[PDB]
Design a binder for this molecule. Structure first.
Ligand SMILES: Cc1cc(C)c(Nc2ncnc(Nc3ccc(C#N)cc3)n2)c(C)c1
Lengths: 428, 554
């Protein structure tokens, strides 16, 4: 029956050597955490020390998950993954689970319980090398390589996919309504059920996964830490590409109309049909900015037709699973953060807003990192792939502080907007 | 016979797809040959090399050099072709320790593993790849063929394997002795402790005892080196540290070298003595890249070397790190995009100092710069001490709040307190959020012809005030700023200004307090004198009120 003796073969692409990425500085406390963790990971055969014959390196650090006090280990496998051959197999990313984003509720489960009990290809382990650095580099950094499937790797879920399907067999047959997705170390579970009823279905699958792993005799014991007891709640049943809205006023100043026209002219790149001739006609002349201009009957109509156009959503807007997803974020002040997700300029697959005041608002960066997580998570639910971010932050600031607030086992790619969007208030 | 433990080899390979070289053995002199044979005979009797045959088609050119006019020679094997074909290793020397991060020690000793080095074997399947040949006398015999059995003293992978091998050996000793610290560099070995010289000297014995369990001969004798040690350009006392003395040279015709890096001499040493500038000396490399050139030392780069030889007068020592006491960093503004800092635990006892130079931007402001310096200092402090220092900064709390709350980018400074040491970093002006009631509205506009480089700039207002000025040799971007500049010059202390220039707005929204462009500075100059300024944008060519593109396209 059982035969986990064989290791699933993995390779890279020709011309691409393994990941050689510098380890970035860590703080004392996160160093201690990684010391004790890796001490036990080696004592559980998951990793093992290596000599200087191994030149490869992938950065590593330490986070703390939501509502938890236990230091966890994250490995920034972003360079290995993209160097890791496009995992051509039964799973390159699952058949598009579009029912997932329609469900009333969606709970996210950390299935980092994990990919242990599964060895790794001996010739490939060298490519998962990492260093635990020391303060001031006073002692040589502790080096390791993974002996089993590591968390954060893109090949890890695509290898366990043959194993994970069988674990979800009593389930998925009992509740054919429930959609189940898997991205990285995360297993997303969605349902059209009432919140009380929905919360119960998760506890069922939780006690159910206490069978194939975590607890129970062996049979089926083994596997990496059972840190799954938590689960965030998502409601994609409450979302959209938010409408562009114009002011409704009884009196308009020259400034008001100057802004209105600015906003409509911008929107016209998105909605062909927008006109501003009649609104601009009121402006003509050099009136003071605070002077009230009464709307003429021609201008009022043009405003009305503009509302119409904007009420109707954008046309010709389709997803393309080959192209990259791009997320832009703007800081609006007062803990408000707007964002857009698109593939083509002015073709938004999704816009939204974020305003959560927790560990805030005196730290923009803490707010921004959480915003990035939220937007990435939504983006995992909708298209099954993270977007490349455009963060309104100087590279240096972000690189110094983001790891202090990050709580996700995955990490998106990002770049840095250095020029202020003129279009900032238009997206509020 | 007391048995010793083997030193496990390290699986070395060549770069994939390649193989060992076959470099020509160049002809020698009879005396150089006679020297090498004696040398290679000794090395063989110790096990450092071995005799091989014709089965080995690999060759490395080995030669001889005199030992500074003496009776003894020196055997040199050119592994330069060996390193280009050897695989890469994990070097750990990258990112050396910084003295300011070390802790005080009562006693610090230096051992020597000169014999342990050749006690470290080489991977046998790789020894074949290390073969050299001594031409015989008169080429009337087959030259002797040798291979290494140990880490060769010129091979690419010799340090990394020596270091790794040595660490694995020291590990249990350092573990059962948590009350001491061990460190290794090259042939040296450092042991420190807070022990009385009796207990300390006896533990040094135990370490040599430890190394003899693997067959590593160690000095024991009263070592010919005492604190302070000279290490990586540092002077390391067991209680103090400072750089190896910095005396700025005295010359009249300073050329390319003695001012510009190179590696020395102010930046490598700005890590300990405070209030040091280098930009005016650094600006002497802008737009230049000469092999040799007596570069004109401006009278702006002497005033820096007048303070540099004022700070280098009284030498400063650096203290070691006390993990109990708090860690503190303090910053000062030095003007010209320059910033200086000291990190200390006790006042005036600087663990280390430093400087930050602003980035190569077109416009900028003090607050942004300070922020960067803070991040650099922060990242550096995590490297050295494993924590972020508490900051003292020449910026009011209220100032910091106004900036970050109203700044389009996300920004952050770790825990910090106001220190009142001028010049204080400030906001020079703040743009209104709403149009100002009662303030004149200046509609401005600027354009230029691409060909003639001729254009115009000016404004019209609600009060009837108008102006257009013709401009020679100018651009679209130039005329758009000039337009705003004019409205600023001619308006009262409060003003509303309407422009269509996305460019101009994007510059002024950035809130610079200084710029490369003089036209931007004159605007900044004008902004500062104003009470309230509201700057509004409208799209171009939509006949939007006031906006008369007709006055500038003429
Ligand atoms: C050159 C060197 C020497 C040693 C003993 C170490 N290891 C180490 N680890 C923690 N604290 C101190 N502290 C320390 C204090 C004074 C001296 C002198 N002279 C040397 C070291 N050293 C290191 C990292 C470098």
């Amino acid at each position: 029956p059982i035969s986990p003796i064989e290791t699933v073969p993995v390779k890279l692409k020709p011309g691409m050597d393994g990941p050689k990425v510098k380890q970035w500085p860590l703080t004392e406390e996160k160093i201690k955490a990684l010391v004790e963790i890796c001490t036990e990971m080696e004592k559980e055969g998951k990793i093992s020390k290596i000599g200087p014959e191994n030149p490869y390196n992938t950065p590593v650090f330490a986070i703390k998950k939501k509502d938890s006090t236990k230091w966890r280990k994250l490995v920034d496998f972003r360079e290995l993954n993209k160097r890791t051959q496009d995992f051509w197999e039964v799973q390159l990313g699952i058949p598009h689970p579009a029912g997932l984003k329609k469900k009333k509720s969606v709970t996210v489960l950390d299935v980092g319980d994990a990919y242990f009990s599964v060895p790794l290809d001996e010739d490939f382990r060298k490519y998962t090398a990492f260093t635990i650095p020391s303060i001031n580099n006073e002692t040589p950094g502790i080096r390791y390589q993974y002996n089993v499937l590591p968390q954060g790797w893109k090949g890890s879920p695509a290898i366990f996919q043959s194993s994970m399907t069988k674990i979800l067999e009593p389930f998925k047959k009992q509740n054919p309504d429930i959609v189940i997705y898997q991205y990285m170390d995360d297993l997303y579970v969605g349902s059209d059920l009432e919140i009380g009823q929905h919360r119960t279905k998760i506890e069922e699958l939780r006690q159910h996964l206490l069978r194939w792993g975590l607890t129970t005799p062996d049979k089926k014991h083994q596997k990496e830490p059972p840190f799954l007891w938590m689960g965030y709640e998502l409601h994609p049943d409450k979302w959209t590409v938010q409408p562009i809205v114009l002011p409704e006023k009884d009196s308009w100043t020259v400034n008001d109309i100057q802004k209105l026209v600015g906003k409509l002219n911008w929107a016209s790149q998105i909605y062909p049909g927008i006109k501003v001739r009649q609104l601009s006609k009121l402006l003509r002349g050099t009136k003071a900015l605070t002077e009230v201009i009464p709307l003429t009957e021609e201008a009022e109509l043009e405003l009305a037709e503009n509302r119409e156009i904007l009420k109707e959503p954008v046309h010709g807007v389709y997803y393309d699973p080959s192209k990259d997803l791009i997320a832009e974020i703007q800081k609006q002040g007062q803990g408000q953060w707007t964002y857009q997700i698109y593939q083509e300029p002015f073709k938004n697959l999704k816009t939204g807003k974020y305003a959560r005041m927790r560990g805030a608002h005196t730290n923009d960066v803490k707010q921004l990192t959480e915003a990035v997580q939220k937007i990435t998570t939504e983006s995992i639910v909708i298209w099954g792939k993270t977007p490349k971010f455009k963060l309104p932050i100087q590279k240096e600031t972000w690189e110094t502080w983001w790891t202090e607030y990050w709580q996700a086992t995955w990490i998106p790619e990002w770049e840095f907007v250095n020029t202020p969007p003129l279009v900032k208030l238009w997206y509020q | 016979m007391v048995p010793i433990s083997p030193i496990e080899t390290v699986p070395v390979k060549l770069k994939p797809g390649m193989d060992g070289p076959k470099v020509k053995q160049w002809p020698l002199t009879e005396e150089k040959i006679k020297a090498l044979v004696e040398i290679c005979t000794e090395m063989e009797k110790e096990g450092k090399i071995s005799k091989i045959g014709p089965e080995n088609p690999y060759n490395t050119p080995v030669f001889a050099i005199k030992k500074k006019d003496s009776t003894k020679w020196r055997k040199l094997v050119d592994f330069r072709e060996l390193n280009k074909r050897t695989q890469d290793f994990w070097e750990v020397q990258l990112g050396i320790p910084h003295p300011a991060g070390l802790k005080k020690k009562k006693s610090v000793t230096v051992l020597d593993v000169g014999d342990a080095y050749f006690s470290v074997p080489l991977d046998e399947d790789f020894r074949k790849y290390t073969a050299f040949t001594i031409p015989s006398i008169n080429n009337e015999t087959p030259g002797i063929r040798y291979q290494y059995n140990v880490l060769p003293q010129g091979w690419k992978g010799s340090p990394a394997i020596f270091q790794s091998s040595m660490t694995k050996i020291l590990e249990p000793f350092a573990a059962q002795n948590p009350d001491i610290v061990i460190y290794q560099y090259m042939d040296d070995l450092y042991v420190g402790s807070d022990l009385e010289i009796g207990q300390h000297r006896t533990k040094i014995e135990e370490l040599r005892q430890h190394l003899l369990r693997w067959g590593l001969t160690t000095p024991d004798k009263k070592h010919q080196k005492e604190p302070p040690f000279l290490w990586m350009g540092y002077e390391l006392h067991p209680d103090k540290w400072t750089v190896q003395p910095i005396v700025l040279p005295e010359k009249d015709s300073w050329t390319v070298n003695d001012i510009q890096k190179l590696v020395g001499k102010l930046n490598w040493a700005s890590q300990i003595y405070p209030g040091i500038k280098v930009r005016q000396l650094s600006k002497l490399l802008r737009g230049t890249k000469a092999l040799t050139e007596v570069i004109p030392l401006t009278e702006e780069a002497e005033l820096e070397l007048a303070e540099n030889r004022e700070i280098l007068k009284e030498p400063v020592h650096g203290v070691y790190y006390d993990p109990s006491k708090d860690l503190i960093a303090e910053i000062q503004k030095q003007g010209q995009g320059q910033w200086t800092y000291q990190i200390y635990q006790e006042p005036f006892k600087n663990l280390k100092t430093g400087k930050y130079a602003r980035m190569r931007g077109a416009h900028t402001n003090d607050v942004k710069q300070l922020t960067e310096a803070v991040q650099k200092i922060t990242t550096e402090s995590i490297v050295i001490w494993g924590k972020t220092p508490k900051f003292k900064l020449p910026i009011q709390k209220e100032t910091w709040e106004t900036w970050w709350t109203e700044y389009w980018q996300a920004t952050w400074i770790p825990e910090w307190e106001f220190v009142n040491t001028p010049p204080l970093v400030k906001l020079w002006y703040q743009l209104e959020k709403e149009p100002i009631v009662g303030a004149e509205t200046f509609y401005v506009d600027g354009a230029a012809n691409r060909e003639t480089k001729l254009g115009k700039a000016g404004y019209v207002t609600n009060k009837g005030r108008q102006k257009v000025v013709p401009l020679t040799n100018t651009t679209n971007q130039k005329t758009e700023l000039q337009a705003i500049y004019l409205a600023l010059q001619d308006s009262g202390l409060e003003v509303n200004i309407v422009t269509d220039s996305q460019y101009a707005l994007g510059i002024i929204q950035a809130q610079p307090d200084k710029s490369e462009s003089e036209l931007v500075n004159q605007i900044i100059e004008q902004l500062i004198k104003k009470e309230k300024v509201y700057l509004a944008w409208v799209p171009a060519h939509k006949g939007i009120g006031g906006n008369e593109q007709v006055d500038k396209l003429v």
